[PDB]
Design a protein around this ligand. Structure first.
Ligand SMILES: CC(C)=CCC/C(C)=C/CC/C(C)=C/CSP(=O)(O)OP(=O)(O)O
Ligand SMILES: CC(C)=CCC/C(C)=C/CC/C(C)=C/CSP(=O)(O)OP(=O)(O)O
Ligand SMILES: [Mg+2]
Ligand SMILES: [Mg+2]
Length: 334
């Protein structure tokens, strides 16, 4: 490996942890392409997240980010976020970007362009409706799914359908993003960031922050269960997506995070601890199960097991209880 590429994998290992391992196991040209895609998205996200950068200054950075991939000198030395190194050493990342085959570059640049436009759109609004929730998640995560799928198809290890079915790829990304948003309520609230959709939470409390108050715990958990139920509606598309993958390393790369997100939602379901910090995800149980689960029947079995755990815990009086049973029964019969 070149020194710059070595550096990129160091950055991947430092700034991911969640994806670092599955990425390094990808076959042939997919490995570098996905590594660089990850690092580029990490840089863009680090700009978006940085609340020390004013809106006026941030908007052009997000819009023009895709063009910086082609500016060999471009770096950003003003970030105060924890992943700032990817911005300060951006030339190393963009150089390895320009070392990828054109067919990968085109995908990565296009997704970066579209993500930047979408992230900037949300700088001046919170998330209101459930449709707006889906739109924000599309911009920050569904497009990652679509990008990854287009990389898989461009590599020719997967069929054109994987890249073409943007709805299924979008659902894959939405499922991860919604799960993270649900899980991270308190951390986000403490850092002054709000991602739960107002049209949902405002039916329970007057301010999203009010879910951190102990007197509102019952309402908080109702809202939590409603949002979890919404996220579960992506699982049918996740199953469809995973069922089409031919390459073992691509299958593992795609399946592992989805299962971890399912285990997370199961741990969060009807759980007061969401509102007091990190909940005990039985993530060890999921990691252990996924070691062996390298095919669709094994992954389905795991999905059902976690759905069954949620199902038998649905409180009779929970306002979403009928909906939660309904989506679980649908998933079971996919
Ligand atoms: C494969 C496919 C079609 C779609 C999946 C698309 C993906 C990967 C969307 C990413 C969504 C999120 C929330 C990643 C952060 S999890 P994290 O914070 O634990 O990740 P990290 O450790 O920062 O790398
Ligand atoms: C596997 C692969 C090719 C790419 C990984 C997906 C990445 C890094 C997407 C960048 C934008 C997002 C949604 C970061 C979520 S981690 P977070 O804790 O920063 O979530 P937040 O942006 O605050 O909503
Ligand atoms: Mg962000
Ligand atoms: Mg988060």
């Amino acid at each position: 490996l070149s020194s710059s590429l070595k550096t990129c994998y160091k950055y991947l290992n430092q700034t991911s942890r969640s994806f670092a391992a599955v990425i390094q196991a990808l076959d042939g040209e997919m490995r570098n392409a996905v590594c660089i895609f990850y690092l580029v998205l990490r840089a863009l996200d680090t700009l978006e997240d940085d609340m020390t950068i004013s809106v006026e200054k941030k908007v052009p950075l997000l819009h023009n980010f895709h063009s910086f991939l082609y500016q060999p000198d471009w770096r950003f030395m003003e970030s105060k976020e924890k992943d700032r190194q990817v911005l300060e050493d951006f030339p190393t990342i963009s150089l390895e970007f320009r070392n990828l085959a054109e067919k990968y570059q085109t995908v990565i640049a296009d997704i970066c362009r579209r993500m930047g436009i979408g992230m900037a759109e949300f700088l001046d609004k919170h998330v209101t409706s459930e449709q707006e929730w889906d739109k924000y998640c599309h911009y920050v995560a569904g497009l990652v799914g679509i990008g990854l799928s287009r990389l898989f198809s461009a590599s020719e290890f997967e069929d054109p359908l994987v890249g073409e079915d943007t709805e299924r790829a979008n659902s894959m990304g939405l499922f991860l993003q919604k799960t993270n948003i649900i899980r991270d309520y308190l951390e986000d609230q403490q850092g002054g960031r709000e991602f739960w959709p107002q049209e949902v939470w405002s039916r329970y409390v007057k301010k999203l922050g009010d879910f951190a108050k102990p007197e509102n715990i019952d309402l908080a958990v109702q809202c939590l269960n409603e949002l979890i139920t919404n996220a579960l509606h992506h699982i049918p598309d996740v199953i469809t997506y995973l069922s089409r993958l031919r390459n073992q390393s691509v299958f593992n790369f795609c399946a592992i995070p989805q299962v971890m997100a399912i285990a997370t939602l199961a741990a969060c379901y009807n759980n007061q601890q969401v509102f007091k910090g990190a909940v005990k995800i039985r993530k060890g149980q999921a990691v252990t199960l996924m070691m062996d689960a390298t095919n669709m029947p094994a992954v389905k079995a795991i999905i059902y097991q976690y759905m069954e755990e949620i199902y038998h815990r649905i409180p009779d009086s929970d306002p979403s209880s009928s909906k939660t049973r309904q989506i679980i029964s649908t998933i079971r019969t996919q």
